[PDB]
Design a binder for these strands. Structure first.
Ligand SMILES: [Cl-]
Ligand SMILES: [Cl-]
Ligand SMILES: [Cl-]
Ligand SMILES: [Cl-]
Ligand SMILES: [Cl-]
Ligand SMILES: [Cl-]
Ligand SMILES: [Cl-]
Ligand SMILES: [Cl-]
Length: 302
RNA sequence: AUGUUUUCUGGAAAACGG
RNA sequence: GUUUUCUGUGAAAACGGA
C-alpha cells in the first residue's frame, strides 16, 4: 500500500511507550520509599516486553516475531490481572465452592485418595455397576475409616469422576482410566478446569497442598496445568477474568480491556501463519500497549 | 543460570511376525 | 511391521538464583 509507513510509525510509537515500562522506576510499585520502588512487572512480563521491543519492524521476519510477542505478552497480562485481583485469603473457599456448585466434592487428600482407590477396587476389572451400588460399595468401606464421609458426599466424588468423563444408570470405567495413576490424573485435571472456569489462578505448589496436603506433587500438578494449555487458552482466560472481576464488582473497569485482549488472542501464533499486514501490525501493537498500560496502572493503584 | 521442573517434539537394543 | 527395555535433539512454559 502507501499507508505501510504510517502503520509502521504508529506501531513503533506503541513499542516505544511499552519500552518505557522496562526503565528502572517507570513501573515502580510505589514511590513513597526506596524499599518499594521494585517494578510491578513480573519476570515473565519483563522478558516478554524485551522480546517485543527487540523486534525489527522494518523487516518481514521482525513483524512476524512482533505479532507472536504481542500475543505472548497479552496472554501473560490476563494471568497477571487475575493474580493481582485475586484474594489469597478467599482462594480455597472460592475453589471448593466452585466444585460443590457443580454437585462435585473433594473430601480431602487422604479421604479422596481412598474413595478413588475404592472406586477402582469395584470397577478396575471392567464391571458395570449402577451408581447406587458403586456408591454403597465405597461408603461401606470408607465410612468406618473416615466417619466424616457419607453416602451423599461419596455420591459427589462419583459425580466428579462422571463430569471428568471417566465413565462409559450403569457406570463402567473407560479402559484408559482403570489404573489409579490415570484415574487420579483425570480427576485432578477436572478440578483444575473447574478452578480455571471460576476465574481462579493457582500455582503448582498450592495445588499440591490443596489436593495432596504436601509439596511432593508439584511437578504432577504442573504437568496437568500444561496439558490443559491450548491455542484457545488465551481467549477462554479472558472470559475467566470476567468471572473473577464480577466476584467483586470491577471498580477499576478492567473489563474495558476485553476487546483488546480478544484481538490479541485471535493472533495466529503458528510459524505457518502469514505475515501480518501493516494494519494488523498496528492494531496488534495498539492492543498490547493498551493492556500492559492497563496492568501497570491497575497494580500501581490497587 | 553449566539452577529446578513441565509441555510438545526423533534413535538404539531385545523378542516376535511375515 | 508388533510388543518390550533404554535413550536423542530441538522449540516452548512455569518456578527461580533476586
Ligand atoms: Cl524497526
Ligand atoms: Cl526481529
Ligand atoms: Cl478473589
Ligand atoms: Cl463451578
Ligand atoms: Cl469440595
Ligand atoms: Cl482427608
Ligand atoms: Cl503443603
Ligand atoms: Cl514435585
Amino acid at each position: 500500500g502507501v499507508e505501510d509507513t504510517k502503520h509502521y510509525e504508529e506501531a513503533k510509537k506503541c513499542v516505544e511507550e511499552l519500552a518505557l515500562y522496562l526503565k528502572p522506576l517507570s513501573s515502580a510499585r510505589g514511590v513513597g520509599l526506596n524499599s518499594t520502588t521494585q517494578s510491578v512487572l513480573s519476570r515473565p512480563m519483563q522478558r516478554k516486553l524485551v522480546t517485543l521491543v527487540h523486534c525489527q519492524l522494518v523487516e518481514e521476519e521482525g513483524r512476524i516475531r512482533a505479532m507472536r510477542a504481542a500475543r505472548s505478552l497479552g496472554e501473560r497480562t490476563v494471568t497477571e490481572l487475575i493474580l493481582q485481583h485475586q484474594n489469597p485469603q478467599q482462594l480455597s473457599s472460592n475453589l471448593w465452592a466452585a466444585v460443590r456448585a457443580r454437585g462435585c466434592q473433594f473430601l480431602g487428600p487422604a479421604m479422596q485418595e481412598e474413595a478413588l482407590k475404592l472406586v477402582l477396587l469395584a470397577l478396575e476389572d471392567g464391571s458395570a455397576l449402577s451408581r447406587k451400588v458403586l456408591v454403597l460399595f465405597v461408603v461401606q468401606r470408607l465410612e468406618p475409616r473416615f466417619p466424616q464421609a457419607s453416602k451423599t458426599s461419596i455420591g459427589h466424588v462419583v459425580q466428579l469422576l462422571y463430569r471428568a468423563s471417566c465413565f462409559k444408570s450403569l457406570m463402567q470405567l473407560k479402559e484408559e482410566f482403570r489404573t489409579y495413576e490415570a484415574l487420579r490424573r483425570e480427576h485432578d485435571s477436572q478440578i483444575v478446569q473447574i478452578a480455571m472456569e471460576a476465574g481462579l489462578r493457582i500455582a503448582p505448589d498450592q495445588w499440591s497442598s490443596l489436593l495432596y496436603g504436601d509439596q511432593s506433587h508439584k511437578s504432577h500438578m504442573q504437568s496437568i496445568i500444561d496439558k490443559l494449555q491450548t491455542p484457545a487458552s488465551f481467549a477462554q482466560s479472558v472470559q475467566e477474568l470476567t468471572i473473577a472481576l464480577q466476584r467483586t464488582g470491577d471498580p477499576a473497569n478492567l473489563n474495558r480491556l476485553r476487546p483488546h485482549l480478544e484481538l490479541l488472542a485471535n493472533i495466529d501464533p503458528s510459524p505457518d501463519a502469514p505475515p501480518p499486514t501493516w494494519e494488523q501490525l498496528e492494531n496488534g501493537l495498539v492492543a498490547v500497549r493498551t493492556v500492559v498500560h492497563g496492568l501497570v496502572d491497575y497494580i500501581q493503584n490497587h
